[PDB]
Design a protein around this ligand. Structure first.
Ligand SMILES: C[C@@H](c1ccccc1)n1cc(-c2cccc3cn[nH]c23)c(=O)[nH]c1=O
Length: 294
């Protein structure tokens, strides 16, 4: 990657996001995870006093050309501003002269939320599951306040830290600014569209908004209440649009309380403008959660 060809204003603006070998040790032989985007390694970040911070280092192996690198730096500036207890922070990025760009994130002791709830050795209560959903709603309320449209909200993209605090995050492809580019990149790399989490209007028009993130949030609540069941497992991705157009939705999970399933149905309202906001979802889910004992 030719770092000398970048826009000098953009280089100045992104400097506060860049971290390098003076503080970060990437443990390339200790792999946390492997995805279609690249790999996630254990990393160590040292502060000025020599104190060690455990981190996850996501390698975005597909970012190579100047336009992709510039868009990566712009996304790092946007996400470096994130500060919320239910949003995974960006510690920094690495733009090396040799190797792919790196995203440095706080290490998440308990991994992704979908894996946690699906594991038969774990026993989260119905109250714990609603609590996870409420944490996701708070993180999404913060992101929505920044006009940040997630597009890929699903239980597998929320992480659990050492205290079981849920952090909204993104372990998918490199984030793009424009919806047209999001579709173009998925087609070019083979990366899967998250069809079964997408709002009806996103499937038909190829556009995403905070109102389509509310639809994905409803699917995420359903994943929580089923302990990670795959949504519409029996509906082919190419038949999902007709299924939604018939007025059909994900069925009420056995352990999902009625008021919470009513919240899910409101998230999947066919008219995007009629869906609740993330602020209304936080208020409503807090009220439901307040009636669970434990
Ligand atoms: C901060 C966090 C996040 C993302 C979304 C919502 C809440 C939190 N985060 C950020 C990146 C990321 C950082 C910098 C540049 C790029 C470019 N693509 N992704 C970037 C990532 O890979 N994973 C991830 O979890």
């Amino acid at each position: 990657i030719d770092l000398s060809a970048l826009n000098p204003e953009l280089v100045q603006a992104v400097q506060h996001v860049v971290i390098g070998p003076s503080s970060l040790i990437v443990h390339f032989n200790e792999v946390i995870g492997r995805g279609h985007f690249g790999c996630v390694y254990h990393g160590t970040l040292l502060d000025n006093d020599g104190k060690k911070i455990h981190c996850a280092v996501k390698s975005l192996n597909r970012i190579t050309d100047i336009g992709e690198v510039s868009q990566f730096l712009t996304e790092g500036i946007i996400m470096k501003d994130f500060s919320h207890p239910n949003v995974l922070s960006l510690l920094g990025i690495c733009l090396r002269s040799e190797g792919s760009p790196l995203v440095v994130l706080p290490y998440m002791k308990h991994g992704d939320l979908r894996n946690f709830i699906r594991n038969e050795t774990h026993n989260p209560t119905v109250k714990d599951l609603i609590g996870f959903g409420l944490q996701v709603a708070k993180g999404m309320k913060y992101l929505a306040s920044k006009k940040f449209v997630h597009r890929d909200l699903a239980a597998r993209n929320c992480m659990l830290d050492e205290k079981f605090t849920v952090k909204v995050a993104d372990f998918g492809l490199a984030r793009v600014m424009y919806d047209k580019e999001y579709y173009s990149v998925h087609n070019k790399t083979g990366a899967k569209l998250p069809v079964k989490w997408m709002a009806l209007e996103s499937l038909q028009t190829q556009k995403f908004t905070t109102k389509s993130d509310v639809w994905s949030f409803g699917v995420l609540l359903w994943e929580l209440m089923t302990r990670g069941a795959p949504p519409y497992p029996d509906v082919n991705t190419f038949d999902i649009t007709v299924y939604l157009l018939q007025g059909r939705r994900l069925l009420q999970p056995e352990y999902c309380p009625d008021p919470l399933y009513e919240v899910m149905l409101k998230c999947w309202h066919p008219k995007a403008e009629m869906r609740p906001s993330f602020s209304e979802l936080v208020s409503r889910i807090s009220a439901i959660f307040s009636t669970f004992i434990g």
